[PDB]
Design a protein around this ligand. Structure first.
Ligand code: SAM
Lengths: 426, 65, 59, 130
């Protein structure tokens, strides 16, 4: 099947308007399998939240990490992270205007614009794999990245600093398009993005799908920002069961299931896109948020403080602050780990917590959290209602609602955590 | 028959052929130290190491194929 | 990082003390009645003993 | 509390291990750290504390014993603890342990920097065999 055009992801799943994980169109895997992609024990599934990787079999634990996917380098797109721009699939002919445009980007501010230029050129380069793959990228109406939002959404975002950063991103992108897609460019550039919408879409995809790694291309150890057509279908998790790895002999990106972890049929195969970034950073770049984000922060200014070590032990949290994890030993999750990283806290070599003054601090910080919730016009479950029923699934608007809801739900978990901490301190 | 493709796969996996073969020799001698079953007939410790490692790669090969 | 395997060989002339210390299984020695020059150092040119003493080899 | 009670909360074990490492008593340290296995608690932080307190208590020889037996057990020390322990060993001239710890550090994926090799060389220069 090394030909054909227009394979597509059946839009039966994005029909949630009246009110879940059907298989992706078999051609979506076939176009890879014909090109030496291999998926081992995993299946592409198509929810209304788009694609995901799910284990199609129970996978036994293994001593080394076990391969679950292999993607060959020929199907990837790459830009060098550092100034001397080179392309290792080398799609772009020498002296093509694309190189002049891509050079006119800031070396470190505009890597997304560079990747967007490559993505568009790879839609124009016939019989490049992304000529076929672009149909499976989310269109401009279904991409979650807030670069496609407008003030109608950002008013619902209710986060003026993040609204300002999104506005700056959009301004930067549109200014770059206006500067470099003016009427004087060759047709072999004007046809890449004849309107601003095509470019802002391409940038939003480049942002939401950019992996970055240190890699070895033969002898050259180098830093790449790259797009991998089946590792970018992995969904985020801060407790990932998989990680990406590079083989340089045959230039394969493996997706590896973690060593010593068993996984179950129908489990989502996920990766840790960027470790240690607050939810507002995931909204800034990727365009999503998660309530269990274990690095989120709260603008506390209280002199009330809680005994950190007792907060850990009451929730059986273990490890150093960079390491905090929870074990089998049940509401404790990434949001409680975020709480331990975020609450105004004190610690001492062995000194025990004052059982009274810690309850006083609990009450004070709980009323602080309550006034923080009171700074929003609505509760969490009102946004839950506004998501269990919704007018038109406007993806940017629903993403802003998910953001706000997640934050409130978080602060709620903070309240519940302090309550259960006091009760369980007995 | 097929086992050498697994060898090549593992040779392709490891970043140094000599370091890979050193690690196989180490694994075999620690196997024959941590277990003292004779394990020396129709199946051999080297093939066992290769089998277990390709099973870590996820591939359905039995012990000594 | 390197396992720093260090080993070295030394060749050297042996003292008469070591000759007495000799006493693939065993070694022995002869008590020479007179000193005797090592042919590798007198004869085999350039004469090393002559190079020390600054005497012509004929001497 | 064990004989007529219930499993201790982690700070109990951590505090008693710290009292060991700050007093000496390193055998009691290892005995209790091994007893922590039966609680399924995270041994990493307790072992780090035991090593750090032993180093601070100048109990360097048994600190080296507990550290090497932990590293051979596959635990990774915090980077500050590798750097401090290597430096203090090399100040003590204990290259016999400094080099071994450096191999375990490399095996833990903390690549030895110019600081660590400077520390090793500071002792190697003493041997008279250049
Ligand atoms: C690397 S891209 C994957 C593309 C996505 N599978 C699609 O259907 O286009 C990550 C995207 O998946 C979604 N996503 C990421 N992390 C998620 C999470 N933790 N939960 C739900 N959706 C998530 C967001 O829409 C985000 O833009």
């Amino acid at each position: 099947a090394s030909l054909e055009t227009q394979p597509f992801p059946l839009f039966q799943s994005p029909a949630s308007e009246e009110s879940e994980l059907e298989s992706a169109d078999p051609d979506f895997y076939k176009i890879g399998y014909v090109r030496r992609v291999r998926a081992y024990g995993v299946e592409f599934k198509e929810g209304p939240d788009g694609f995901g990787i799910y284990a199609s079999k129970d996978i036994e634990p293994r001593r080394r990490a076990r391969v679950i996917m292999e993607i060959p380098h020929e199907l990837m797109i790459t830009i060098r992270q550092k100034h001397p721009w080179m392309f290792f699939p080398d799609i772009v002919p020498i002296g093509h205007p694309i190189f002049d445009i891509i050079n006119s980007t800031d070396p470190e501010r505009d890597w997304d614009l560079r990747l967007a230029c490559l993505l568009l050129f790879s839609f124009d380069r016939e019989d490049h794999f992304w000529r076929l793959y672009g149909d499976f990228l989310p269109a401009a109406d279904e991409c979650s990245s807030l670069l496609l939002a407008t003030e109608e959404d950002l008013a619902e975002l209710q986060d003026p600093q993040l609204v300002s950063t999104i506005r700056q991103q959009q301004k930067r992108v549109l200014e770059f398009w206006e500067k470099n897609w003016h009427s004087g460019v060759p047709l072999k550039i004007k046809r890449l993005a004849e309107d601003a919408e095509r470019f802002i879409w391409a940038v939003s995809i480049a942002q939401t799908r950019c992996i970055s790694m240190k890699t070895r291309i033969g002898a050259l150890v180098q830093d790449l920002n790259m797009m991998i057509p089946y590792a970018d279908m992995l969904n985020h998790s801060f407790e990932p069961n998989c990680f990406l790895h590079w083989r340089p002999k045959d230039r394969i990106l493996e997706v590896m299931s973690n060593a010593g972890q068993a996984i179950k049929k129908g489990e989502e195969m996920t990766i840790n896109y960027m470790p240690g970034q607050k939810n507002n950073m995931l909204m800034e770049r990727y365009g999503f948020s998660t309530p269990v984000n274990p690095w989120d922060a709260i603008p506390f200014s209280g002199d009330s403080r809680i005994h950190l070590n007792s907060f850990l032990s009451v929730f059986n949290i273990f490890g150093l602050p960079e390491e905090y994890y929870h074990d089998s030993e049940s509401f404790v999750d990434g949001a409680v780990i975020a709480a331990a990283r975020t609450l105004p806290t004190w610690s001492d070599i062995d000194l025990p917590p004052i059982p009274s003054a810690e309850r006083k601090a609990v009450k004070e910080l709980q009323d602080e959290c309550r006034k923080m919730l009171a700074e929003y016009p609505t509760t969490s479950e009102q946004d839950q209602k506004l998501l269990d029923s919704l007018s038109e699934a406007r993806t940017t608007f629903a993403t802003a609602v998910k953001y706000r809801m997640h934050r409130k739900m978080f602060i709620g978990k903070i309240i519940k955590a302090l309550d259960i901490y006091q009760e369980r301190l007995l | 028959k097929v086992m050498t493709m697994d060898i090549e796969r593992l040779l392709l996996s490891e970043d140094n052929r000599f370091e890979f073969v050193n690690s196989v020799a180490a694994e075999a001698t620690e196997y024959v130290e941590k277990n003292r079953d004779e394990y020396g007939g129709t199946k051999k410790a080297i093939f066992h190491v290769l089998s277990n490692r390709v099973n870590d790669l996820g591939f359905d090969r039995p012990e000594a194929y | 990082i390197d396992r720093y395997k260090h080993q070295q060989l030394r060749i050297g002339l042996v003292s008469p003390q070591q000759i007495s210390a000799w006493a693939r299984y065993q070694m022995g020695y002869i008590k020479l009645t007179c000193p005797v020059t090592h042919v590798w150092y007198l004869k085999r040119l350039p004469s090393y003993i002559a190079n020390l003493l600054d005497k012509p080899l004929k001497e | 509390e064990l004989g007529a009670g219930q499993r201790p909360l982690p700070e109990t074990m951590i505090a008693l291990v710290r009292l060991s490492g700050s007093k000496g008593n390193a055998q009691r340290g290892l005995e209790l750290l091994a007893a922590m296995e039966k609680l399924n608690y995270d041994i990493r932080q307790a072992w780090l504390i035991l090593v750090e307190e032993l180093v601070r208590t100048n109990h360097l020889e048994e600190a080296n014993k507990v550290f090497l037996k932990g590293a051979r057990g596959g635990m990774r020390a915090t980077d500050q603890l590798y750097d401090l322990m290597i430096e203090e060993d090399c100040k003590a001239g204990d290259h016999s342990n400094a080099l071994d710890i450096s191999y375990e550090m490399e095996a833990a994926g903390r690549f030895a920097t110019t600081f660590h090799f400077n520390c090793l060389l500071s002792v190697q220069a003493t041997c008279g065999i250049p």
